């Protein structure tokens with residue numbers, strides 16, 4: 428019954444900003460915040476992130492596993508309780524277990540922070556988790572598209588250190604992974620329904636926090652197409 | 654309708670012998686062997702288990718979390734497939750599980766945490782991964798437990814007897830630790846778990862010290878005695 432739409436975007440692209448604004452506009456509009464963000468600054472979540480920063484080749488499996496499990500737990504609790512009640516309920520997933528795997532876990536394998544066996548076991552469990560703990564299927568995706576330069580700027584326009592603004596080439600790689608997944612629909616996934624799911628792309632390069640009506644108009648009619 | 658019964662015991666107790674004896678006796682009895690015994694000797698599962706088995710023997714404080722999480726998932730999958738994917742049919746259906754999600758957690762994992770092969774974060778993560786899942790999925794709760802009790806010396810003797818290498822045995826001291834953990838769970842019942850039907854689950858304890866390959870009738874009789882009380 429409850430509508431489910433994940434917000435996607437590269438690091439610091441403006442998802443939390445967008446999702447916090449989106450939730451304020453309707454009592455029908457509810458959100459599930461991303462577990463990774465806020466693990467920075469429960470105890471298990473602080474630890475893995477720091478070690479993962481300190482040494483990605485040791486903790487990427489452990490981290491990627493606990494993050495996807497945290498997201499699933501979170502997304503069930505606001506589904507099996509929160510808002511509805513509501514007349515036309517929509518639940519905005521701040522990121523998803525698809526970008527958990529096909530963006531972040533995948534990048535870590537590709538910079539050799541997980542070896543082949545970590546990454547196959549991860550990819551196996553992923554299926555088994557999504558298949559057992561089913562009704563998480565998205566009806567739409569909203570992609571907040573931005574240039575890697577904008578995100579580089581926005582990481583700086585936030586709070587750098589502790590997190591820091593990493594390489595621009597690291598942002599380009601996640602950019603091209605986001606573009607290849609959401610803009611071009613070429614990434615092949617085990618979850619067949621994804622090819623048959625609507626995507627709203629949003630050029631978020633221009634600043635929006637005090638001027639976002641045009642973005643919400645696009646979101647409201649995208650919602651109407653569902 | 655299916656009875657779910659675990660076969661537990663120290664390493665080289667003869668769990669795998671015993672379960673392979675019980676499967677030959679009754680049409681209503683079936684076996685779910687150790688996913689982890691098929692990783693000693695083409696299905697990425699075996700490719701992955703094969704690889705995480707050796708890495709673990711080569712570096713336990715690097716690999717304990719990954720091995721333990723993988724073993725438990727594989728066992729959960731094997732229990733789910735055997736169960737609602739078998740013979741029923743059957744008059745008095747019984748499924749023996751060779752070990753359980755519970756030896757995985759309170760024998761092996763806990764032992765690895767006590768030995769610094771997992772840090773606090775890992776052990777805590779493992780535990781809420783195990784807590785969450787065996788409540789979400791797990792049908793696999795048990796109608797009973799059978800306790801095959803041997804001494805660590807019989808166990809080390811039998812480790813030697815089996816095959817060794819990539820499975821191996823070595824320390825008599827380690828077997829002693831595991832042997833002690835099984836008593837607290839299954840014989841004194843002082844080991845309190847995160848599962849409260851388990852403080853109260855019926856437990857059959859079979860002394861398997863003396864070889865039972867050619868003399869198993871009295872043990873099988875007790876099992877039968879035990880099942881028809883469940």
Ligand SMILES: O=c1ccn([C@@H]2O[C@H](COP(=O)(O)OP(=O)(O)O)[C@@H](O)[C@H]2O)c(=O)[nH]1
Pocket residue numbers: 436437438439440441442443444445581582584585586633634635636
């Ligand atoms: O239109 C925008 C969107 C974001 N930001 C800033 O960029 C930083 C990162 O944005 P956010 O946390 O929302 O990014 P996320 O990682 O959640 O996508 C924050 O300081 C925002 O204030 C901005 O100045 N204008």
Ligand SMILES: O=c1ccn([C@@H]2O[C@H](COP(=O)(O)OP(=O)(O)O)[C@@H](O)[C@H]2O)c(=O)[nH]1
Pocket residue numbers: 662663664665666667668669670671811812814815816863864865866
């Ligand atoms: O009554 C017995 C039971 C066990 N074995 C041998 O003990 C070894 C270890 O047994 P198993 O692998 O079944 O022990 P498990 O790990 O399954 O408890 C094997 O080589 C068995 O053939 C034996 O000689 N006599």
Ligand SMILES: Nc1nc2c(ncn2COCCO)c(=O)[nH]1
Pocket residue numbers: 438439461463464491494495522526527528531532
């Ligand atoms: N959303 C998300 N972020 C991750 C993951 N792994 C590492 N990060 C880094 O998060 C900080 C930037 O979003 C993951 O699996 N999901």
Ligand SMILES: Nc1nc2c(ncn2COCCO)c(=O)[nH]1
Pocket residue numbers: 664687689721724752756757758761762831
């Ligand atoms: N059956 C089983 N064997 C394990 C496990 N972990 C390691 N091994 C292999 O045995 C050596 C440690 O006792 C486990 O969780 N289950």
